[PDB]
């Protein structure tokens, strides 16, 4: 079984970040699961390195649009399921407003029946004391819109939207990201008209863990086409 079949249940999801922010190295592993019927993902992340250098707010974006829930009208338009087992490529810049700037690049793919997410980022010219390096942000999460359109000339999709993460003095740091995706996978794929996810998450922590951690609970649900 392959394709739109393999979501209709809870599928095990893994990331592994290796980091680099203003020369600050880190990595962080997270597991949980998730069931794209409901568009439900739960993950727990740890940094294992020490400290993470960066606030976890600023990695939500970072840590499976594969689990949005595409209505049946809208089901013809879900690119990241068509694409699955081979997987896709995700490469992303984000630019946060007057600091400095984040650039991904993920490997989605299933690796037997555990879907797995694995990134590379690096991040450059970030103020020692901003934001972003100083912890200066709220841990919560607002709701947001993510905007697809097709790019057939790379046989993928084009994707951008911005974040806002709340400062502790009630401003906001804006992040503009800049994603796209191309099938990992030599073949046919689902180019989407144009439509967007609505994204609700939620950040917690467990009270069991000594280490530093982020509890994640995101709602996903595909809308924009009638």
Known sequence: SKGEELFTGVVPILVELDGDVNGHKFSVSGEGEGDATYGKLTLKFICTT?????????????????????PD???QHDFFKSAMPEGYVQERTI??????????????KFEGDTLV?????????????GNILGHKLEYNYNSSNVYIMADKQKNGIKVNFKIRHNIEDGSVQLADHYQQNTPIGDGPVLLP???????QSALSKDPNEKRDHMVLL?????????
């Open 50 to 70: 020490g400290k993470l250098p960066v606030p976890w707010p600023t990695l939500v974006t970072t840590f499976l649009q594969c689990f949005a829930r595409y």
């Open 73 to 75: 009208h809208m089901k």
């Open 95 to 108: 630019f946060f407003k007057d600091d400095g700037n984040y650039k991904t690049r993920a490997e989605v």
């Open 218 to 226: 995101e709602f996903v649900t595909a809308a924009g086409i009638t």
């Open 193 to 199: 008209d144009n439509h967007y996810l609505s994204y």
């Open 117 to 129: 997410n694995r990134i590379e980022l690096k991040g450059i010219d970030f103020k020692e004391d």
